[PDB]
Design a protein around this ligand. Structure first.
Ligand SMILES: Nc1ncnc2c1ncn2[C@@H]1O[C@H](COP(=O)(O)OP(=O)(O)O)[C@@H](O)[C@H]1O
Ligand SMILES: [Zn+2]
Ligand SMILES: [Zn+2]
Lengths: 379, 179, 138, 167
């Protein structure tokens, strides 16, 4: 047998490499540069025609299997990591591309949350997945994902990128280099997603709960006269060479707060753990609480893990969660690989198990016969 | 334009000798060391300096206007000297292009206003796109396209370059006639 | 190919999937009678090579070395092939003036042999987990 | 109006205009475009110029304000300075030990220091003094990086003394 390849198709970035390795070999933006198109189209797009999606995935998988990885597709197996409740037609297409065009031996559709649990070694743990599109949580108890007690909110990368763009356009101060030393607002109508992502990573950080709670009430201005903490210094960011955008200190520590803002509904990235944990079985409560896992690149943002764990323990004392989750000890697990590449590492650890892989995985001979991929929906 | 090469009428003033046509406008300071064995074209306002050179060019070589081919200086501890470059067979240097390259391979299409760095080797059957910067001491494999300010692998070329490029340079030469 | 606009007049392929492609890109199948596209045809892997120091490596050596050249290096700041400069060797880029001295990697006495990448921090924990799951899978 | 200096291997075939002031050990390559429109072109020793290099002192043509009384704006250039292929330059004051790359458009009022390099095919029209020993790379973005040590180019210049004769 040969070392099975691991792919993990995401909206922002795709993880690729081989099984039984310390981390992924290639990690790249999930896009393709088609002739005529100035900006490259995104390879994973939900709610489009199958033929157009088929062509994009055919183009992308080709780049992964030749330019990034150097190996024959037909020779060795595949371990496709994809999140639970991934759209039906997308997963059906992705398999149909691998089985028909590339003619792979067998694909294994592992849920990202159960794979993240294997990397630690613990059999039972709560898993939060703060991705690009949606920040999803799914309790895993001793190998069994509990779909009953699922939770998701659109407070990921996409929702954060959009919030940054909005704030920058309000307090817009750019030095074009054409008598634009004076503050010039909205010279460009929209900012490209590639720039916004680079600003987010380098400039913006996650504030402490004490400082963050003041920032929330400050921008609200709820019958108070200038009750904001002192912001960090303003950082100057180059746009397309000559144009120098002066990023305000307030924007850096306020953009993140949309994730941890209550917004009346009581629906934050913090609340989603406690909302799910309260809905879980009474016996499983204390085991899941003690074993928390924080995967996804959105949680890589500096000082996110401290704010989350703090915001949890504050929301615990709130009267809604005070009865059930009152006297619970919330402890976070530190996975071996980085927060972005926890999902991938599980699939590699699973891919190294040649004996179990072949049995669990769906063979091409079965797919060609039936034409029915197994899912958590009815058969 | 749609596969077919288009007409280009040259003026009376041009040095036509043994097939090799060289525009009189285009200075080539150092005529001794530079050598053009085949039926080469050098368009107006182009430079081929003899700064301790040995500039050998192809059978059907083409260099469009405002374009420079200068040899690079090798930073050697023994002795600092200008390395003699060798342009390959059927080489197409595009307009306004800068070339400080040592050993340019055969059957290559160098793009418009693209700066190739010092001591840069190019292997046969490659293509550099327009508005691109190849840094000093870089190599580009066959059936490749290098682009961007970094100057890195963009993709692969069509399989039939060796056969196709012959038609292009020979057609341009044949189509390029006096008025 | 590009100078003359080959991407204008296109030829059609017969089969399941119909595609409009230039004749320059397409391939003729001699075994039968039907020209097929780069898309339609299946791709294989023959040989691996480094784009800087053109050295044909075997398939077995690539798997051990993780599809990389030992001698050649690419700069991290910008993406370009680095060059060894002496004073006793330091690694420097031509495009950007990023050096190996900047990050604080010590100069090596031997040219190529000395340079190395540090071992992965969670490599020991990795093998222990594989062997546990391997026994458990068995 | 020419102040030719001995030791400097300025080639006669290169084009020169206006009230020039030539340096001690400068080496000008052929088809190097130097003009002294308003004020003089002051050249430091070892300031070699390669290929196309548009060095003009035409601030009266650029703006034409009819201000600053006389406004000579004398073009001061430093020592050991490499002007590469196709690089446009127009700097009233320019420091020593700086190497602009090929096809580099330098601004109308940009002051260069030591150990500083402009990116190849990169244009900078905006007026802004360059920090001490920092390099710019790429056209798409500037992406400024501070160098460890300044780079000298003396050996190159010294060897041209031997070549230029009989050319
Ligand atoms: N190392 C990092 N540091 C900070 N932010 C990151 C990092 N890596 C990714 N991100 C951000 O977090 C997001 C993570 O998305 P990712 O988990 O890769 O995608 P998906 O959820 O589709 O699998 C990216 O879109 C990016 O904005
Ligand atoms: Zn190599
Ligand atoms: Zn670099």
């Amino acid at each position: 047998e040969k070392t099975a390849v691991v792919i993990d198709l995401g909206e922002a970035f795709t993880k690729c490499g081989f099984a039984g390795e310390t981390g992924p070999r290639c990690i790249i933006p999930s896009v393709i540069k088609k002739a005529g198109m100035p900006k490259p189209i995104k390879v994973v797009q939900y709610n489009i025609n199958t033929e157009e999606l088929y062509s994009y995935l055919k183009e992308f998988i080709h780049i992964l299997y030749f330019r990034h990885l150097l190996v024959n597709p037909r020779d060795r197996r595949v371990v496709v990591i994809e999140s639970v409740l991934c759209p039906s037609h997308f997963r059906e297409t992705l398999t149909r591309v691998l089985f028909k065009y590339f003619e792979v031996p067998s694909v294994l559709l592992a849920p990202s949350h159960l794979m993240a649990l294997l990397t630690l070694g613990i059999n039972s743990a709560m898993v939060l997945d703060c991705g690009y599109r949606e920040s999803l949580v799914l309790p895993i108890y001793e190998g069994i994902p509990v779909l009953n007690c699922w939770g998701a909110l659109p407070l990921g990368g996409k929702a954060l990128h959009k919030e940054l763009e909005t704030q920058l356009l309000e307090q817009c101060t750019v030095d074009t280099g054409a008598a634009k030393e004076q503050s010039l607002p909205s010279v460009m109508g929209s900012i490209p997603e590639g720039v916004l992502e680079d600003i987010k990573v380098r400039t913006c950080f996650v504030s402490d709960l004490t400082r963050g709670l003041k920032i929330q009430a400050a921008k609200f201005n709820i019958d108070g006269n200038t009750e904001r903490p002192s912001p960090p210094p303003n950082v100057d960011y180059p746009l397309d060479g000559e144009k120098i955008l002066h990023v305000l200190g307030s924007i850096r520590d306020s953009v993140v707060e949309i994730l941890f803002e209550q917004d009346n509904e009581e629906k934050s990235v913090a609340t989603l753990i406690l909302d799910s944990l309260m809905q879980c079985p009474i016996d499983t409560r204390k085991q899941l609480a003690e074993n928390l896992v924080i995967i996804g690149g959105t949680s890589m943002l500096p000082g996110f893990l401290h704010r989350l764990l703090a915001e949890i323990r504050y929301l615990v004392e709130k009267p809604k969660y005070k009865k059930t989750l009152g006297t619970k000890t919330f402890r976070i697990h530190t996975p071996p690989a980085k927060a972005n590449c926890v999902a991938w590492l599980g699939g590699a650890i699973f891919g190294a198990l040649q004996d179990i892989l072949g049995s669990r995985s769906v063979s091409k001979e079965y797919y060609n016969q039936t034409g029915r991929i197994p899912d958590w929906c009815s058969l | 334009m749609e596969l077919g090469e288009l007409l280009y009428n040259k003026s009376e003033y041009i040095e036509t000798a043994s097939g090799n046509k060289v525009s009189r406008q285009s200075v080539l300071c150092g005529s001794q060391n530079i050598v053009l064995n085949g039926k080469t074209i050098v368009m107006n306002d182009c430079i081929i300096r003899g700064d301790l050179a040995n500039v050998r060019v192809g059978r059907h070589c083409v260099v469009k206007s405002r374009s420079v081919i200068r040899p690079p200086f090798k930073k050697f501890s023994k002795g600092v000297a200008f390395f003699p470059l060798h342009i390959g067979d059927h080489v197409f240097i595009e307009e306004d292009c800068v070339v400080n390259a040592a050993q340019i391979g055969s059957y290559v299409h160098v793009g418009k206003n693209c700066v190739i760095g010092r001591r840069c080797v190019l292997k046969d059957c490659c293509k550099i796109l327009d508005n691109t910067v190849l840094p000093p001491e870089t190599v580009v494999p066959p059936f490749t396209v290098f682009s961007g300010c970094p100057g890195l692998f963009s993709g692969e070329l069509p399989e039939c370059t060796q056969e196709l490029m012959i038609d292009v340079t020979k057609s341009y030469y044949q189509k390029f006639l006096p008025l | 190919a590009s100078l003359l606009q080959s991407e204008r007049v296109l030829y059609l392929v017969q089969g399941e999937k119909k595609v409009r492609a230039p004749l320059s890109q397409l391939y003729f199948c001699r075994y039968c009678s039907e020209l097929r596209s780069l898309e339609c045809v299946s791709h294989e892997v023959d040989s691996h090579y480094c784009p800087s120091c053109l050295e044909n490596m075997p398939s077995a050596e690539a798997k051990l070395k993780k599809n990389r050249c030992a001698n050649c290096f690419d700069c991290p700041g910008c993406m370009h092939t680095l060059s060894t400069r002496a004073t006793a060797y330091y690694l420097a880029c031509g495009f950007c003036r990023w050096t190996s001295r900047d990050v604080g990697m010590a100069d090596k006495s031997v040219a190529s042999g000395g340079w190395q990448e540090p071992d992965h921090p969670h490599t020991q924990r990795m093998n222990k987990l594989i062997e546990y799951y391997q026994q458990l899978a068995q | 109006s020419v102040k030719i200096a001995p030791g400097a291997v300025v080639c006669v075939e290169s084009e020169i205009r206006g009230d020039v002031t030539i340096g001690p050990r400068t080496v000008i390559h052929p088809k190097a475009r130097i003009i002294a429109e308003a004020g003089p072109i002051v050249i430091g020793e070892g300031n070699l110029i390669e290929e196309q290099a548009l060095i003009i002192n035409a601030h009266p043509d650029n703006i034409t304000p009819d201000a600053e009384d006389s406004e000579p704006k004398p073009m001061i250039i430093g020592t050991n300075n490499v002007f590469e292929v196709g690089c446009y330059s127009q700097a009233m004051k320019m420091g020593d030990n700086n190497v602009i790359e090929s096809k580099a458009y330098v601004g109308r009022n940009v002051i260069l220091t030591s150990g500083c390099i402009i990116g190849a095919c990169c244009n900078l029209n905006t007026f802004e003094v360059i920090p001490e020993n920092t390099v710019i790379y790429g056209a798409d973005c500037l992406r400024r990086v501070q160098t460890e040590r300044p780079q000298p180019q003396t050996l190159q210049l010294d060897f041209l003394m031997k070549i230029l004769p009989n050319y």
